[PDB]
Subunit: 105 residues, 2 copies
């Protein structure tokens, strides 16, 4: 299992509400069509205009190889096109999971 994490900066924090609606109703809604995505969630870190980043996304994937293929689909290209009108990735963190992790009952 692997995890990719992005810091996301809005070009304009006035657009937060469009961004968040897109995330919840378009970005999340498209994840069933990306076979490599096991878990995906986005988190609001800051809405200061000049923040180095406003959001963090956490993508849990089967393996990087599978995710890379999913990125080459037109399903993904449609997500990127919309994302890129509002926001940019300013850092990527990635790793391979140790063991199975913990998840509450």
């Amino acid at each position: 299992m692997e995890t990719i994490i992005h810091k996301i900066r809005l070009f304009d924090v006035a657009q937060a509400d469009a961004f968040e609606f897109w995330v919840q109703n378009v970005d999340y809604a498209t994840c069933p069509d990306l076979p490599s995505v096991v878990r995906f969630d986005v988190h609001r870190a800051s809405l200061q205009a000049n923040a180095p980043y406003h959001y963090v996304e956490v993508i849990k994937i089967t393996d990087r190889a599978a995710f890379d293929a999913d990125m080459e689909t037109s399903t993904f290209a449609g997500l990127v096109q919309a994302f890129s009108r509002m926001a940019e990735v300013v850092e990527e963190l990635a790793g391979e999971q140790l063991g199975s992790g913990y998840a509450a009952g």
Copy 2:
């Protein structure tokens, strides 16, 4: 729901195997005793000696208030004591989740 993410740097990458055994068999194993922790997992990013960080941890919590209380327990103090012999947090990212996220069937 909130998420806390740490970049973790080992003082000495020779100790990776002790660190990873501790994470999987002690750190993960203690999470049932921390009521605020909903999900927890650690990820190996890099084992270059001079890397700014080697690991990333992702902590999903009910709310920051509940987590803060859990940190004041002696359960947590025992985790910190061990952690601090091997590693240091070099960055914290945190946010409030947008909606319910996506999780594969």
